[PDB]
Every structure is written in C-alpha cells, then in structure tokens.
Amino acid sequence: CPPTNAERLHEFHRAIGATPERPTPPPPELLRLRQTLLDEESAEVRAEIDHLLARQAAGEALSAGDLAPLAHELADLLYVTYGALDQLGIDADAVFAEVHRANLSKASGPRRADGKQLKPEGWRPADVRGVIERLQH
Amino acid sequence: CPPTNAERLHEFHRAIGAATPERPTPPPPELLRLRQTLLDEESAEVRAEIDHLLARQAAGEALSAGDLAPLAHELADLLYVTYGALDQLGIDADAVFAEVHRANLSKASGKPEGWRPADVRGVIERLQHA
Ligand SMILES: O=c1ccn([C@H]2C[C@H](O)[C@@H](COP(=O)(O)O)O2)c(=O)[nH]1
Ligand SMILES: [Cl-]
Ligand SMILES: [Mg+2]
Numbered sequence: 165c166p167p168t169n170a171e172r173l174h175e176f177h178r179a180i181g182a183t184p185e186r187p188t189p190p191p192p193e194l195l196r197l198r199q200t201l202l203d204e205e206s207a208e209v210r211a212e213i214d215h216l217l218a219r220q221a222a223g224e225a226l227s228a229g230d231l232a233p234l235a236h237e238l239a240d241l242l243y244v245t246y247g248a249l250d251q252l253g254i255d256a257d258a259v260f261a262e263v264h265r266a267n268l269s270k271a272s273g274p275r276r277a278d279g280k281q282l283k284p285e286g287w288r289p290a291d292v293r294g295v296i297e298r299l300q301h
Numbered sequence: 302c303p304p305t306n307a308e309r310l311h312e313f314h315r316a317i318g319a320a321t322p323e324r325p326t327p328p329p330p331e332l333l334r335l336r337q338t339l340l341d342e343e344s345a346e347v348r349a350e351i352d353h354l355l356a357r358q359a360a361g362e363a364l365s366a367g368d369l370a371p372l373a374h375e376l377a378d379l380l381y382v383t384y385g386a387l388d389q390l391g392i393d394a395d396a397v398f399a400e401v402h403r404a405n406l407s408k409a410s411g412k413p414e415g416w417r418p419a420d421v422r423g424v425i426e427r428l429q430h431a
C-alpha cells in the first residue's frame with residue numbers, strides 16, 4: 165500500500181511546518197484562502213482547455229505531448245483540492261471512496277447531450293455525513 | 302490494498318461507457334468541453350458550500366465537524382471530475398501528481414540549489430511507452 169495523493173498532501177503540509185488528524189472546523193480566513201487557491205488553479209486549467217479547443221477549432225491536430233500543460237494544471241488543481249480537505253482534517257480517501265460508490269450506482273441512468281452521466285430513478289446519494297462522523301469517532 | 306482515486310475513475314468510466322484510454326490520447330473537442338463543464342459545475346458547488354459556512358460563521362455560529370460534510374462532499378466531487386479529465390485523456394493521474402508533488406515538496410526543502418520544476422511533458426512521454 166503506497167502513499168495516496170491525499171497522504172502526500174499531509175506530508176507536504178508537515179514539511180512546510182504546517183494539519184489536524186481529525187475533521188476540524190476551520191477559521192474563516194482558512195476557508196477564504198482555500199477558495200482563492202481553487203480559483204487560481206481552476207482558472208489556469210480553464211485557460212489550457214480553452215487553448216486546446218482553440219487549436220482544434222483552427223484545424224490543428226493535437227499530439228499527446230500537447231496535453232502536458234493541461235495535465236500539469238489538472239494536477240495542480242488536485243493538489244489544492246486535496247490541500248483543502250487536509251487542512252480541514254478530513255481524510256479525502258474516505259470521502260472519495262463513498263462518493264465513488266454512489267457514482268458507480270449511476271451507471272443505469274441516462275446521459276446528457278454533452279455526455280454527462282445523469283442519475284437513474286431511485287438513485288441514492290453518498291452519505292458523506294456518515295464518513296465525517298466515523299472519521300471523528 | 303485499496304484502488305487509488307485515479308484508478309476509481311477508470312472503473313467509473315468503464316462502468317458508464319465513457320472513453321478511458323490506456324495511454325495519453327489527444328481528445329476530440331467534445332471531450333474537452335465536457336471536462337470544462339463538469340469542472341465549472343463542481344467548482345461552483347464548492348464555492349456555494351464555502352460561502353454558506355462563511356455566512357454562518359459571520360453570524361457567530363460555532364461550526365461542528367458535521368457541518369463540514371456538504372463542503373467535503375463537493376470537494377470530493379471536484380477531485381472526481383478533475384481525476385476524470387485526466388482519465389479521459391488517458392493520462393495516469395497518479396504519475397503526474399507524483400511529479401507535481403516531487404517538485405512542490407522539493408521546493409519546500411530549500412528554493413533548493415539544483416531544484417527541478419515539475420516535468421509533466423516528461424511524465425507523458427514515459428506513459429506513452431510503459
Ligand atoms: O459524467 C459524469 C457525471 C457525474 N460525475 C461525477 C462527479 C461527481 O462526483 C458527481 C457529480 O454529479 P452531479 O451531482 O452533478 O450529477 O458525479 C462524473 O464524474 N462524470
Ligand atoms: Cl469521450
Ligand atoms: Mg497551476
């Protein structure tokens with residue numbers, strides 16, 4: 165069992181001499197900081213997606229290597245998203261596992277015109293409250 | 302050993318019949334547009350939940366661990382669609398994240414002399430040949 169990306173963030177925060185082991189209500193300034201970071205990386209991802217679409221619209225063919233800047237920015241977005249969960253003292257893997265379980269159960273649902281998977285009749289959402297509760301004991 | 306979150310996305314896309322290439326693969330524009338839309342949707346929900354928490358705190362509410370559940374759920378949904386973009390591009394998210402992490406952690410050990418920025422182009426080259 166190698167380290168997860170969530171565990172990596174925990175390692176990173178310690179390394180920079182900075183997070184709780186259990187779910188911990190944050191100060192307002194912490195929430196505002198995490199929002200700022202999400203917005204910054206999100207904007208950089210958007211810029212790269214826009215640029216790839218623009219090159220395609222121009223009639224250019226994309227190589228695999230052309231995807232590097234987008235992949236970098238998506239990983240940066242992962243980094244700050246995991247970063248937020250870690251600062252809240254929330255095990256991202258525990259939450260993600262439950263979100264995943266409920267996502268799997270969408271398979272019989274219809275699809276949106278753009279390709280988004282939608283929810284079938286009778287679908288039940290992930291119980292993330294339940295995850296937070298057992299993480300805090 | 303549990304699957305990684307990236308590996309979970311592969312399972313999900315296989316289950317719903319969405320594209321999930323084994324190796325890095327230049328996508329059609331339709332795929333890129335969907336990834337942008339999903340990122341925008343989940344980032345808006347995260348923003349909504351952060352805003353709710355802020356507004357409650359401003360009114361003097363003492364937040365409990367349980368109060369973090371909606372935000373935690375939306376942050377995980379944002380991870381989900383971010384991993385999902387990488388998976389649909391056929392790019393191993395764990396390999397790219399590992400390189401970003403190496404760079405970030407390295408930078409904090411200083412900026413060190415001999416530090417090397419994340420080389421994601423290099424990771425993508427190795428993925429093509431694994
Ligand atoms: O095509 C899809 C549709 C949904 N999701 C995921 C991301 C989130 O975890 C969640 C959000 O879906 P909605 O609640 O917006 O329907 O399901 C995808 O990854 N791809
Ligand atoms: Cl696709
Ligand atoms: Mg960035």
Ligand SMILES: [Mg+2]
Nearest residue numbers: 343346375378
């Ligand atoms: Mg959501």
